[PDB]
């Protein structure tokens, strides 16, 4: 049994990767020092592989992003960066002022950099696969370079501001592209490379027959090389076309979906090649019953095994996590432990090893069918809310978070590392409330000074959810986070945000909004049990959140905001599966947002465009939705304008909070004036695009004053 693994985390057990990057960016260390740090990580990674599997990947230590690495390999460096000068340029492309766009890698919380294709001509600018292959080879360690395949690379790239995903857009680029892959592979083989790991996750996307025609041509041109093709994150819809590819080894993800297995049972698997069975989950941290896995492997008739999808979605190691809820650690397995499972699975399959390792649940299961809608419909709630709030036309507000002083950051760190902290928080809130009132904002926020991030803050306060000490996972570049683990029934023992919001409201006559995170978002940034349906977990969390809403309502809070960024982001990769997904995502949100008619519910959505989801948005029980309209100068409004029967209020983001610039009153006006083209003025709120936690006070205060001034003008 041939054992593969891929995507082992690169960050190191002590996050040496993060420290190396930031120490280089801040100049604390030289480039030669940086490369020495990197070389340590390389060896650490392969040593983990060497101890556990048969095929050892190289070219996996990307200094920022592997898609960016691919772009550089094929010479796709945009004109604005000029001559490619190595690391300096690389990091300018990744994190510079004019950096490439960053976006989510398929349906995961990893973010890659979007290549920009300016020329139709690709060339070999740098051969990192050969470089890394020789690095390990010189040490007497044979490795298989890990590369992003030509189709997927193009599929993840943009040209002229748009994806390159229509078959008629890809053809010519593919021809030039493949030529560069041919050169790279030839160099590898000429140097004695025996196997190359080609990643083609885009094969699991909604493709047409014409895509597969192009893909067929690409791999015909590469059929002389020893390639193993990997696919993951979902099933490959056109199974027959996929197993027809002229490659000798093909990997499928048999964990994230049922269709791969079903299709394999139907059409069988070509004798002309070998199956690599991706059967150990790369995305969840649960130890599996290896006897069950072994049986699956036999049913598949596979002679090779591996993880289903990249291991870098897991933390490095469980070893030192010794303050987890009793009995939990024994059910877990992080990246290192996943390699060990593969080794054990191989050992078992080869015969070398014989020993292998309600009250709230009822509420959910028995939810009345009426629980998923609010008491009164929008039109009637609206009159009640407006009468209660007495807001002016074009009310102004903000999205929730405020700038964090070094003091605020340090204090929060100290506390995490109670009475003194609370006092400090109450102090910053008073200041923020007074500042907002002085500026003349209509609806206020408490600023979220007490929160690290919108998921961890709540995860830490919910039963059934654990948080780790060192379970770091790379989000992008040098930024890591620790995903919570939803290990049991989720409930909310005590109020989570009452203290802060209540105090805040007691300082002003103006409405102060409650500030919560939705259920799907909490799930999306966490690990969770697989023996229970996603929807039931979401509902549990949603009911817990609704507990907070009621408590907020009881304390007299008139407005509650529920941020659900994962609404679209957790949608399946396959469009055909959307309706079933949104059915429960909608239900989950509505359970959380089940508020009295008198309570105005706000929902913030970060999406750059709502055209594909407007139909699902229309089913949510919010009263106000805030959108980020600045970057499109208001054109994002099109989806709402063209939705016959849109009657809900819209919070128009008129200010790009990812920039230090203070927008002029006219710059904001352009946006507000655009949204007012069709929609009635009574629906329009004015706010920033998003939270202000990344901004500085010096730029926020002037921007807010301009926002208020604009509202005043607009009313007149
Ligand atoms: Zn946002």
628 Cα: distance to centroid of ligand 1 (angstroms): 7
Q: How far apart are CA 227 and CA 148, in angstroms?
A: 12
Resolution (A): 2.1
Q: Which residue in the list 111, 267, 313, 658 is annotated as catalytic?
A: 658
Phi, psi (degrees; rounded to nearest 5) at 103: -155, 165
Q: What's the CA-to-centroid distance between 653 and ligand 1, angstroms?
A: 9
Give the closest residue to 388 by CA, choosing from 595, 617, 690: 595
Residues 6 or more apart whose Cβ sits within 8 Å of residue 635? 674
Residue 192 is assigned to a ligand binding site = no
Cα 505 to Cα 564: distance, rounded to the nearest angstrom:
24
Alpha-carbon span 679 to 232, nearest angstrom: 43
Do the annotations mark residue 569 as ligand-binding? yes
How wide is the angle at C-alpha 34 spanned by C-alphas 31 and 40, nearest 5°? 145
What letter does residue 623 receive in the DSSP assignment? S
Query: Is residue 584 a known part of a binding site?
Result: no
* Helical H segments across 243-289, by residue range: 259-267
Distance 564 CA to ligand 1 centre (A): 10
Q: What distance in angstroms lies between residue 606's CA and the mean position of ligand 1's atoms?
A: 4
Q: How far is the CA of 659 from the centre of ligand 1 (A)?
A: 14
In the residue annotation, 658 being an active-site residue is answered as yes
**Beta-strand relationship, 473-476 and 479-481:** antiparallel
For the chain, the C-alpha Rg in angstroms (whole number) is 27
Distance of CA 565 from the midpoint of ligand 1 (Å): 8
Cα–Cα separations (whole angstroms), residue 30 to 12, 78, 109, 420, 688: 20, 26, 31, 41, 40
| Cβ atoms 679, 654 nearer than 8 A | no
CB 114 within 8 A of CB 71: no
CB 267 within 8 Å of CB 250: no
Strand 600-604 to strand 649-653: parallel, antiparallel, or no bridges (unpaired)? Answer: unpaired
Ligand 1: distance of its center to the CA of 399 in Å?
A: 8
d(CA 475, CA 458): 19
Residue 230 and residue 251 in contact, taking contact as beta carbons nearer than 8 Å = yes
Query: Which method, experimentally, gave rise to this model?
Result: X-ray
Residues in the chain: 716
Question: Is residue 205 part of an annotated ligand binding site?
Answer: no
Helix ranges (DSSP H) in 257-334:
259-267, 290-300
Displacement of CA 713 from its chain's centroid (Å): 39
Residue 618 annotated in ligand binding = no
For residue 715, say whether it is annotated as part of any ligand binding site. Answer: no
> Measuring CA to CA, which residue among 198, 185, 305, 296 is closest to residue 248?
198
Distance 464 CA to ligand 1 centre (A): 28
CA distances from 530 to 285, 463, 486, 515, 538 (A): 10, 18, 10, 29, 13
- What is the CATH code of the structural domain delimited by 358-468+484-716? 3.20.20.210
CA-CA distance, 621 to 373, in Å (whole number)? 7
Q: Which part of the chain is CATH 3.20.20.210?
A: 1-357+469-483, 358-468+484-716
Separation of CA 256 and ligand 1 centre (Å): 29
Is 18 annotated to bind ligand? yes
Tell how far the Cα of 275 is from the centroid of ligand 1, in angstroms. 43
Q: Quick one: which of 295, 300, 302, 254 has its CA closest to 274?
A: 302
In this structure, which topology does domain 1-357+469-483 adopt according to CATH? TIM Barrel (3.20.20)
Known binding residue 401? Answer is yes
242 among annotated binding-site residues: no
3-state secondary structure of 145: strand
Query: Is residue 234 a known part of a binding site?
Result: no
């Amino acid at each position: 049994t041939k054992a593969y693994a891929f995507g082992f985390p690169k960050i190191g057990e002590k996050r040496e990767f993060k420290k190396a990057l930031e120490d280089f960016w801040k100049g604390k260390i030289t480039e030669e020092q940086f490369e020495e740090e990197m070389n340590k990580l390389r060896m650490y990674m392969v040593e983990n592989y060497r101890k556990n599997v048969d095929v050892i990947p190289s070219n996996e230590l990307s200094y920022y992003d592997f898609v960016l690495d691919t772009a550089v390999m094929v010479g796709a460096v945009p004109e604005r960066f000029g001559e490619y000068r190595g690391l300096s340029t690389y990091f300018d492309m990744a994190r510079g002022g004019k950096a490439l766009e960053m976006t989510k890698f398929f349906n995961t919380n990893y973010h890659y950099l979007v290549p920009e294709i300016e020329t139709e001509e690709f060339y070999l600018l740098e051969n990192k696969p050969l470089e890394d292959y020789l690095f390990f080879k010189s040490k007497g360690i044979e490795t298989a370079p890990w590369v992003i395949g030509p189709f997927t690379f193009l599929y993840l790239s943009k040209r002229n501001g748009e994806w390159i995903r229509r078959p008629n857009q890809m053809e010519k680029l593919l021809e030039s592209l493949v030529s560069v892959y041919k050169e790279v592979f030839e160099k590898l083989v000429e140097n004695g490379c025996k196997e190359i790991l080609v990643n083609e996750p885009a094969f699991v996307c909604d493709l047409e027959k014409a895509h597969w025609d192009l893909i067929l041509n690409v791999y015909r041109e590469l059929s002389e090389f020893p390639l193993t093709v990997f696919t993951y994150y979902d099933s490959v819809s056109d199974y027959e076309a996929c197993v027809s590819l002229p490659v000798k080894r093909l990997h499928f993800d048999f964990v994230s979906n049922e269709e791969n297995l079903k299709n394999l049972e139907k059409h069988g698997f070509p004798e002309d090649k070998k199956l690599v069975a991706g059967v150990i989950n790369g995305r969840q941290p649960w130890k599996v019953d290896l006897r069950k896995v072994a049986s699956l492997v036999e049913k598949l008739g596979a002679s090779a095994i591996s993880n289903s999808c990249p291991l870098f979605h897991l933390p490095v190691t469980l070893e030192l996590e010794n303050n987890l809820p009793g009995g939990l650690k024994e059910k877990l397995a992080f990246a290192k432990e996943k390699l060990e499972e593969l080794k054990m699975l191989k050992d078992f399959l080869e015969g070398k090893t014989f020993d292998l390792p309600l009250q709230a649940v009822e509420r959910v299961r028995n939810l009345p069918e009426d629980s998923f809608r609010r008491e009164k419909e929008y039109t009637e709630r609206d009159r009640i809310q407006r009468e209660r709030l007495n807001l002016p036309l074009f009310p102004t507000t903000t999205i929730g978070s405020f700038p964090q002083t070094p003091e605020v950051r340090k204090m929060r760190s100290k506390y995490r590392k109670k009475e003194e902290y609370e006092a400090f928080i109450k102090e910053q809130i008073k200041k923020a409330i007074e500042l907002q009132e002085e500026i003349g904002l209509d609806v206020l926020v408490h600023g979220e000074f007490e929160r690290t991030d919108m998921v961890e803050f709540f995860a830490e306060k919910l039963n059934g959810i654990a948080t780790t000490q060192n379970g770091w996972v790379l989000s992008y570049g040098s930024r890591c986070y620790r995903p919570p683990i939803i290990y049991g029934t989720v409930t909310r023992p005590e109020p989570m945000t009452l203290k802060e919001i209540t105090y805040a409201q007691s300082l002003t006559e103006k409405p102060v909004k409650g500030m919560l995170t939705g259920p799907v978002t909490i799930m999306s940034w966490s690990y969770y049990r697989e023996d229970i349906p996603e929807r039931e977990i979401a509902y549990q969390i949603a009911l817990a959140i609704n507990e907070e809403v009621k408590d907020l309502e009881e304390a007299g809070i008139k407005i509650v905001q529920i941020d659900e960024p994962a609404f679209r982001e957790k949608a399946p990769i396959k469009k055909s599966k959307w309706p079933e997904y949104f059915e429960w995502a909608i239900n989950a949100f509505n359970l959380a947002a089940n508020a009295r008619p008198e309570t105005q519910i706000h929902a913030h959505m970060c999406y750059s465009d709502f055209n594909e989801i407007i139909e699902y948005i229309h089913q949510l029980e919010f009263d106000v939705i805030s959108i980020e309209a600045s970057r499109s100068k208001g054109e994002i409004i099109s989806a709402f304008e063209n939705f016959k029967g849109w009657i809900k209020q819209i919070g128009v983001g008129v200010w790009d909070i990812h920039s230090p610039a203070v927008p002029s009153i006219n710059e904001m006006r352009e946006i507000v004036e655009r949204v007012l083209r069709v929609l009635p003025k009574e629906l329009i709120w004015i706010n920033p695009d998003c939270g202000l936690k990344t901004r500085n006070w010096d730029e926020v205060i002037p921007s807010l004053r301009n926002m208020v001034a604009l509202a005043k003008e607009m009313r007149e």
